[PDB]
C-alpha cells in the first residue's frame with residue numbers, strides 16, 4: 001500500500017497549514033463547479049444569451065469544470081503529501097488534462113479578443129455567427145490536444161529514495177536542453193503570446209469605446225436649451241449680423257485630406273452663382289491651413305450670408321449652436337467614429353455628412369443626408385436638397401435624429417460593459433496564472449530552486465500558485481455575475497428553480 005509508506009514518512013515533512021490549503025480547495029471546488037455549471041446552463045437555456053462572446057465563455061467554463069473534477073483533487077493530494085497515489089496511467093492523463101485546459105483557456109480568451117476587435121475596430125465590423133464560433137472551439141480543442149501530446153509523453157511515475165520510498169509523478173527528459181526549450185515554448189504559447197495579443201487588442205477597443213466614441217450623455221442634452229428653436233436660431237443669426245434663413249454649420253480643423261473644409265468651400269463656390277444661395281446661411285468654424293483660412297475669409301468678405309469663426313469656442317457655445325442651426329455639414333474624407341454627428345443629432349441639428357466611417361454607421365436615410373466623400377458637386381446638391389426640405393416643418397426629422405443618436409449611444413454604452421467585463425477576465429487571468437507561469441520558467445528554464453536555501457518556502461509558493469490556478473476558474477463566474485446583467489439575472493433564475501421551483 002502506497003498510503004502506509006506515506007504514514008511512515010509523514011514525520012519528515014509535517015505541514016501544519018494543511019487545513020488552510022484544504023479549506024481553500026474545498027471552497028474553490030464548490031464555487032468553481034457550481035458557478036461554471038450555471039454559466040453553461042444560462043447560455044444553453046436562453047437563446048438571446050447565445051452570442052459569440054458567450055459561446056466562447058461557455059467553452060471556458062467547460063475547461064474549468066473539466067479540471068475542477070479531474071485534476072483539482074489530485075493536485076490537492078500531491079501538494080499536501082508530496083506523493084503520487086494514482087496510477088502511472090493517471091500520471092500521464094491528469095497532467096495532460098490540466099495543460100490542455102490551460103491551452104484551451106488561453107486560446108479561447110484570445111479568440112474572444114479577436115472577435116470583439118473585428119466587430120468593434122475593423123472597418124468591415126464583421127458579425128460572427130454561432131457556427132463560426134463553434135468551429136473555432138472544435139479547432140481550439142484539437143490544437144490544444146495536439147500541442148500537449150509531448151507533455152504527456154514525458155510524464156513518468158518513478159520511485160524516489162529520501163529507507164522508505166516515494167512514488168512521484170514528474171516530467172522525465174533525456175538531456176538538459178529539451179526541457180529548457182520546451183518550457184520557453186510552453187510559456188509563450190499559454191501566457192506571454194496570448195496575453196500580449198489581448199493587451200494590444202483591448203487597448204484599441206478601450207480607446208475607441210471609451211474615448212473616441214464616448215460621448216457625454218449628461219452634457220449633450222437638449223434640456224440645456226431654452227425657448228423655441230426658431231427663437232434661438234433667430235438670435236443666433238442676429239449675433240453674426242445675418243437675416244433669418246436656413247442655417248448650415250461646419251465645425252472642424254482646416255485640413256488637406258481630413259475634415260473636408262476644402263470640399264465645403266468648393267461647394268459654396270458652386271452654390272454662390274445660384275439665386276437660391278441667398279436663402280442659406282453658412283457658419284464655418286475652425287482654423288488651421290493658412291491658405292484655407294484665406295479662402296474661407298475671402299468668401300466671408302464677399303457674402304453677407306457667410307461667417308467664419310477661427311477663435312476657440314467653449315463646449316456650451318457649440319452645444320448652443322447645435323441646438324439652433326438647421327443643419328451641420330461634416331464633409332470628412334476620413335471619420336472612423338463620427339462623434340460630431342452624435343453630438344449634433346442629440347441637439348436636433350440635421351447632419352449633411354460624407355458617407356464614410358462612423359458617419360456611414362451613425363447616419364441613416366431617415367436621420368440625415370449622406371454624400372460621396374470629397375465631392376463638392378455632390379455636397380452642393382445635398383445643400384440644395386436640405387433647403388427644399390426646409391420650406392416645410394423639420395420637427396419630425398429632428399426628433400428622428402435625437403432618437404437615432406440616443407439609440408446609437410445606447411449601443412456604445414452596451415458595448416463598453418461587455419468589453420469592460422472581458423477586460424476584467426483577462427486581467428484576473430494574468431494575475432492567477434502569472435505565479436505558476438513565472439515559477440515554471442525559473443525552475444525549468446533557468447534552473448532556480450535546485451540549490452535550495454529554504455525548500456519549505458519554495459514548496460509553499462508552488463502550492464499557492466496551484467490553488468490560485470483553480471481559484472481563477474471559481475473567479476470567472478463571479479465576474480460574470482457582477483459585470484453582466486444578463487448573467488446576473490440568469491444566475492438568479494437558476495437558483496430559484498433549483499431551490500424553490502420558482503420560474504425566475
Ligand SMILES: CCN(Cc1cccnc1)C(=O)CN(c1ccc(OC)nc1)S(=O)(=O)c1ccccc1C
Pocket residue numbers: 071074075078094095096098099102169170186190433436437440465466467469470
Ligand atoms: C507545465 C505545467 N506546469 C506549469 C504551468 C504553467 C502555466 C499553466 N499551468 C501550468 C506545472 O506547474 C506542472 N503541472 C501542474 C502542477 C500543478 C498545477 O496546479 C494547477 N497545475 C499544473 S502538471 O505537470 O500539470 C502536474 C504535475 C504533477 C501533478 C499534477 C499536475 C497537474
